[PDB]
Each structure stands twice: as C-alpha cells, then as structure tokens.
Amino acid sequence: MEKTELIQKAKLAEQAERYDDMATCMKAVTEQGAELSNEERNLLSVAYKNVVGGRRSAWRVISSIEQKTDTSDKKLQLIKDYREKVESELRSICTTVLELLDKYLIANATNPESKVFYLKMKGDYFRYLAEVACGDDRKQTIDNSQGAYQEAFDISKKEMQPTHPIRLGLALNFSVFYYEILNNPELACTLAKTAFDEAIAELDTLNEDSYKDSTLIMQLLRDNLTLWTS
C-alpha cells in the first residue's frame, strides 16, 4: 500500500481504536524510508503507545498478583508463566519500535526536533523494557534508556526553546525515568522543576495555541512534582 492510503487507513484505525492496525500502517509508512512529518510522527507514537500500553497494564496487574501470592502456592507457577507471556509480547513490541527508530527514523532524521523526538522514544521504550528486566539484563537496558534520554536532553537544550512541547515532554519522561527506574526522587524532582521554571520564564512570548500546548505539559510536570513531594 502507498503512503497516502496508509496514512488514511492509520487515521481510520485510530478513530476505530484499532491500534494494532494503526501501528501496522505506520510501520509500513516508516519502512518506506522517507522522513515523517510531525503529524505522521504523532500517529506512529500514538499507535505504538496504545499497543504497548495494553501489555504494560496487563503486566502490572499480573505481577502485583504474583507478589501477593504465597511462594509455596501451587497456583504460583501458572501466574508466573502468564506474566512471562505478557513480558514476551511487551518485549516484541519494544523491539519492533526500537528497530524502526534505529534503522529508519533516527538514521534519516534531518532536523534536531525530529532527532529529539526519536531519541526520547528510544528512551521511552528502553524504559518499558527496564520495568520488566531483572539482573544484568536490567543494568544494560537501563543504560540504553538513560543514554538515549541524555542525548535527547542535550540536543533539546542546545537546539530548542524551553517551551517547545517536545523538549517539555522529554523532561517529563526523563524525570519519571529518574524517579521510577533509577529510584532517585530528588533528581527527578529537580529535572522536572528546572524544565518547568525555564518554561514559565518564556510562556508569555507564545501565541495562545502554543501557550496551550506548553501549559498542558508543564501542568503534568507540576502534577508529578506534587505527587513526589508528598
């Protein structure tokens, strides 16, 4: 299928909440090899976030039950095996996304905004892998997530205004990485706080549409700060 039809089908799938189909369409678009527009980037991001989110939520539920279950319980092996199946599906999804990022999206990106968007995505999906990893595997996976986030962070600071929604969303997710993966709430708070403060300093120079976009993410940064400082 040609690009225009793929995008049409992807948007139709989005409306129908058929996110597997939506992701399949945007994967085909990506593999065609041309750079994505901002709209196409969002479609890709929305599709795979919904596809992976189903496995993430299932995994959280199953693992909570596994932890509550007595280690001598004969029922435990089934719960563990089921968790492992969901884990395998989660890994497959993250691996597909990371392959798209390495082979096509980061490789062909021609501007810092897109590169930051894709390196953030790389950090996000390595972070999803880190949430389910154990042992040495975990150390390297965390390293892969952190390295992507840090590079995206440096680029964004050099190339983008502090109110840019992509830079703000990066700071949001990177701060969550510090909080949830590295278990450092103090650095997570300071990361989100710095991003928020540097943004308010420049809000009043935006038009009302951009003001809306930036304000929404800034509120999410403050939402996290409130949660973490309680």
């Binding site: 929305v46 976030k49 919904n50 989110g53 997710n173 969550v176 999410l220």
Partner: peptide, 9 residues
C-alpha cells in the same frame, strides 16, 4: 503512577 507522554487512550 507518574505522568508520561504520550498517554494511552
């Protein structure tokens, strides 16, 4: 949980 972007629908 903490807020991250994008969000599930």
């Amino acid at each position: 949980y903490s807020n991250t972007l994008p969000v599930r629908k």
